[PDB]
């Protein structure tokens, strides 16, 4: 769920607040359209697409599904006690949190005008 994804980011990127990623480029947070503006935006685009895929599973709601995961000593793991929905969503989240950690953050791309720039 979003609370858990929140916590995954705090684990892999303890250097910046989670709100930094909540409204960035065309794909991070609300939007899902247009040309991804940079590497970080591409992380989010893959993440958004991943959620759309997981939504194909009966009764699977990525923002609300509670999965089983761990974050300790620099390692993020999705656990074995996840069903197919939970396992897919956990994996989407984990791969994005990993993506975020390796991607440059450009202040210019924060809170951009989606209507004008993400067509």
């Amino acid at each position: 769920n979003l609370y858990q994804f929140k916590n995954m980011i705090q684990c892999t990127v303890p250097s910046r607040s989670w709100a930094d990623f909540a409204d960035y480029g065309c794909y991070c947070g609300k939007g899902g359209s247009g040309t991804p503006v940079d590497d970080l935006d591409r992380c989010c685009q893959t993440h958004d697409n991943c959620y759309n895929e997981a939504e194909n599973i009966s009764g699977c709601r990525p923002k609300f599904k509670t999965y089983s995961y761990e974050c300790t000593q620099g390692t993020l793991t999705c656990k074995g006690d996840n069903n197919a929905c939970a396992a897919s969503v956990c994996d989407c989240d984990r791969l994005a949190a990993i993506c975020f950690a390796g991607a440059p953050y450009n202040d210019a791309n924060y809170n951009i005008d989606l209507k004008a720039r993400c067509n």
């Binding site: 979003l2 609370y3 994804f5 929140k6 990623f21 909540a22 947070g29 958004d48 990525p62 923002k63």
Partner: peptide, 7 residues
């Protein structure tokens, strides 16, 4: 949760 949207 308790927020808007990060994903």
């Amino acid at each position: 949760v308790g927020g808007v949207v990060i994903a």
